[PDB]
Amino acid sequence: QLIPEGPAKPGFLYTIGLSNKGMPGLYRLELQVTKGSGKLATSGLWNSSSAKEQVKIAFDYFKANASRISGGSKVMEHDFHLHVVELQNTGPL
């Protein structure tokens, strides 16, 4: 057992960014959503505090601006687990 055709499972995306070494790298982010209390779980972040805090600010904005995007879905009623998988062994994002 990089990006297959067709829509992947929802919550799964690919982002690109310069690594700690400045080289571009492609990472795939996977989100699992269950019924919960708005908890945020993180994994695969290369234990990097910067990415952890970036995701924290993002989820803060998501809670603050949920009604504009979701059209009524409550973020606080679901728990989210987000994981990072590097596709090109370039380095941490």
Which residue's CB is nearer to a second copy, number 47 or number 67? 67
Can you tell me whether residue 42 is helix, strand or coil? strand
Count of residues that interact with a second copy, criterion CB under 8 A: 5
Q: What count of other Cβ atoms lies within 10 Å of the Cβ of residue 82?
A: 19
Applying CB under 8 A, among 7, 10, 22, 72 the residue interacting with a second copy is 72
Which residue's CB is nearer to a second copy, number 21 or number 68? 68
Min separation Cβ 67 and a second copy, Å: 8
Residue 77 within binding range of a second copy, rule CB under 8 A: no
Residue for token pair 């019924």: 35
Alpha carbons within 13 A on the beta-carbon side of 5: 0
C-alpha 51/C-alpha 42 separation (Å) is 10
Stretch that binds a second copy, among 22-30, 37-45, 50-58, 70-78 (CB under 8 A): 70-78
CA gyration radius, the chain = 14
Report the interface residues with a second copy, using CB under 8 A: 68-72
